[PDB]
Design a protein around this ligand. Structure first.
Ligand code: CL
Ligand code: CL
Ligand code: CL
Ligand code: CL
Ligand code: CL
Ligand code: NA
Ligand code: NA
Ligand code: NA
Ligand code: NA
Ligand code: NA
Lengths: 254, 260, 263, 261, 263
């Protein structure tokens, strides 16, 4: 039950800047690789069903907990405004390939970010009838099998991104669940097309819904979840170097 | 030409909401039930595909039906459910590793695309056309414009078949939405050519579609049902047809007065 | 010229008796290799090779401006004159995805791709056009089409003296040598986009919920001074398997009202 | 360039104070043996690297088209002057399909590097002379090169970057750029494209205006009685030949304006 | 940071005595294989092959951030200062079409295409940047440039401890390993777009009639706290005939006014 927002004063508002690292899976271990660049992609036979954990990208996950607050009404932190910019280099010389000429980053892309008062809700799906995912580090939809390539009430697994072990290659954001959350995604096909990426210093995102309510930190935490798959360069998967976030909080009665 | 009166002021008792997923439909080569697949069987070669592609190498319009709670009915003024607002988002994965092809490198999804959705108080009205002078369609599962022949590749008053999407057997490769018929319906489509271009697909959590026409009237469920019809052909990957994994819908209803 | 010396007065307030609506489809036109009647085809015959195509392509390997004519009901008419005025229209193109019909014998999926031309025009008279040549040797079909110069070439540039000025009165005008005249089309609204030819795909949107207003700076639509409205259009989508494709057919919903004019 | 002039009230527009002209402007290809311009939409075949990279034949390059308009004459203390406040401009263009079929087989079209540009002014367009590379000279024939038998820098130089005004049809779009530091009493507009064989996309209509008033509601002032149109529409390459727009249309809308003597 | 601990008051109402304007050009910078002075080139030396380029490309095969500095006239005449404030600017890039200079020896028209990077920044201090590596082995030129690590590699990811934080004080910063810091650039407005590398063409617009406003949420532009304004930019257009091209040069028109500040 959402009541009036506390009029914002120096005592009622909170700001944080932070960077979020991209996540590549781990071929022999359980800690995430904070890499912008993956290990070489395996060949069809392997990649099509069981790609090495370090040839896939996972949702990065970051958690923010603003200062503690000092009845029948309760005061809660509300995210109402944010800036987010991705760190990115041009690959030119690092793009020169042994054949000769300039390959670059190109191919399939996935840009996504999410802010919420809880973990991001996702759905487990398969691209094809035989894709399993890494047999190693990642939480697959089915740990040694395949889930359908279509929505199933009974068989489509419903998970929450609580760790950095969720491959963007088999987990989609759930459009039927993500309350108290704003999320945003674009994906691209794969006839070797270039990523186009803009970045500025002068660009805000408002977060208020139809009723002027932002994201409510009901449990004291805010959940950031994101991924910026840029494509492939020299048979290696590239992501954004890292993503910046400036979060603007105020207090709200509940 | 029915008689639309005032919308009932929306209260907790007069409004209705549903969330649902719609599955993509691939045709059935050895059967009559639809395949709920995001990925098809391998495409046949020119000689076959150009005239009679296997039913499981084509995409069909998905069809879903919603019937909101009964309205306990003045033998003069009726109450009708009215769809005035909706959200729709498509579920989609990036194909990277599943995109690696045997020759080496990263193929992806690319090629011809077709995005389409429709909401209505009746089935979607369509027109039967042929891409070329010899395209028949699957000789198997689908309702073809002409069951063992070809219809013209042009609009004909006499020869262009006019059907309504009442089942999941209508191939997007020979059925187009009828711009001269779809009253009490809002529909929307984009198609792409085929020099192996990538699909670009956005999805969000914060995006609405208003459905009111010039007179502020949404879609009226005159028979108590709302008809959803859609297709999201994403292109081809490794000689196989891909669609969106599934499409989400949140429907917003209110009640509206109509005269007999 | 077309609107010259016409004196436009108040629009008649629109009532059930003063307004008129029509829906219609317009068929694409491919030229005719051994005839004079138009081929209503969305798909052409196979393209000839350079030597032929570059100068004299077979009439059935080119697209012509489709032409359709609408005449609203008679008006029971002093110094004033009621006249039909087109003020609003919807137009949508019928289009299929070519996937299986796109599979080519070499293997894989060719599609429609290459040079494109989208165009439509509404007017109270035929569309005014200018005859030009893409190159120094393009003549056009020696068969069915009205060429800028029957067995020669016209310049590849605007010439006051040598650039032919015609009006699209029939379905014999090839989009490959006739351009809309920007210096003539009064009492007419027209619209065109063309694409180059490094095999790029057509992108085509269609809806149910999209209008075009037709009123000019003075709030005057298209006036049917002779009782007829002239529709002129072409939707060249590109090439698939060495064959020219167009839109299947184009839909039109025309909205008319009455308007006062001096004699 | 504009300073010194003192702009007063615009004369309220009546049938006696306003002027309109429609006109076409022809594209210009250079002349391999001659000093008159070729009014061509299509050039002669492009030379090979060794030649083209440094000294391309004059008829393998595009030059800025130039057209001049002088409205009717006008008759004490302060002057009446013609002011361009509104214009329409549309390019004439064909689809190349059959003329696009190439001897190898299939449909080549127009594709490659593009340059769209137009300018309206009360004086010639001010340009800057630059070189794409360290060895590009330009045609040794018809064109005014930045340096008639040498190269100018591939970068702005206060001392070495030549500053000219487009007074004739001899200026190659391949070595002359509009000067962003000079063009007062002028509105100009340009887009260029790179060269991995990409197609031109070109729109044309009947129902599209360009307003020309600046921040102070002042259009282009014809201080010397003439208006200067300058333009170029490089569409790309088809069958090893350079194509431009067929011709560009212009409808110019003039009114009168007061200026202190 | 750069702003925090400053107290901004009313802008001085702009009169002929309180406002200042400058026009200037900024030259592109290619690195120097043998020297320490920058090469003001729009075109680089031929790109090295993978083995070299991937880790240690020759300084003259990379682009560096151009840097330009503007210092407006001194302000004459306690408890508060007058300061110069940039509130408006125009910026346009000088660019040629490469057609004939694009013809390549194998035949046909190559052009400029491939990876692109457009960027500009205005500030009251140097632009803050972060040192990152594209890959696990990229070092940069062993010659002219300030590398993130002068003989080694820095991470390909943000590290609080290991990601170097520098300020662009000279023309020795390679756009191939230095990114603008989104967590630092107060009293600065910056803007960038990058493109991937499947040989895609640059598309570049330029006009005469296009402004950029610079006021923030509170209507405050860029404040020249030390009397200088810092311009920093780069326009990597792509590659033509195995050579790196940039914009020829970038124009700037800067609009200043005066503003009150507490000491
Ligand atoms: Cl189910
Ligand atoms: Cl018929
Ligand atoms: Cl003449
Ligand atoms: Cl200098
Ligand atoms: Cl850290
Ligand atoms: Na941005
Ligand atoms: Na969306
Ligand atoms: Na539309
Ligand atoms: Na236009
Ligand atoms: Na601009």
């Amino acid at each position: 039950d959402v009541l009036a927002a506390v009029p914002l004063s120096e005592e009622t508002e909170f700001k944080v800047e932070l960077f979020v690292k991209p996540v590549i899976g781990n071929a022999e271990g359980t800690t995430p690789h904070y890499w912008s660049i993956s290990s070489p992609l395996k060949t069809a036979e392997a990649a099509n069903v069981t790609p090495d954990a370090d040839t896939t990208v996972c949702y990065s996950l970051s958690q923010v907990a603003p200062p503690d607050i000092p009845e029948c009404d309760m005061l809660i932190w509300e995210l109402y405004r944010m800036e987010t910019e991705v760190l990115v280099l041009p690959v030119l010389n690092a793009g020169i390939l042994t054949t000769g000429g300039v390959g670059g980053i190109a191919g399939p892309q996935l840009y996504f970010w999410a802010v919420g008062g809880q973990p991001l809700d996702v759905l487990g799906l398969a691209p094809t009838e035989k894709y399993k995912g890494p047999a190693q580090y990642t939480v697959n939809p089915k740990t040694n099998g395949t889930v359908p390539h279509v929505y199933s009430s009974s068989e489509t697994p419903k998970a929450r991104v609580t760790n950095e072990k969720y491959s963007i290659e088999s987990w989609v954001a759930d459009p039927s669940r993500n309350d108290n959350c704003r999320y945003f995604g674009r994906m691209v096909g794969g006839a070797a097309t270039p990523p186009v990426v803009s970045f500025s210093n002068n660009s805000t995102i408002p977060l208020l819904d139809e009723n002027g309510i932002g994201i409510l930190c009901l449990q004291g935490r805010l959940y950031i979840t994101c991924a910026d798959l840029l494509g492939v360069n020299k048979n290696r998967v590239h992501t954004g170097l890292s993503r910046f976030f400036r979060l603007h909080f105020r207090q709200r009665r509940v």
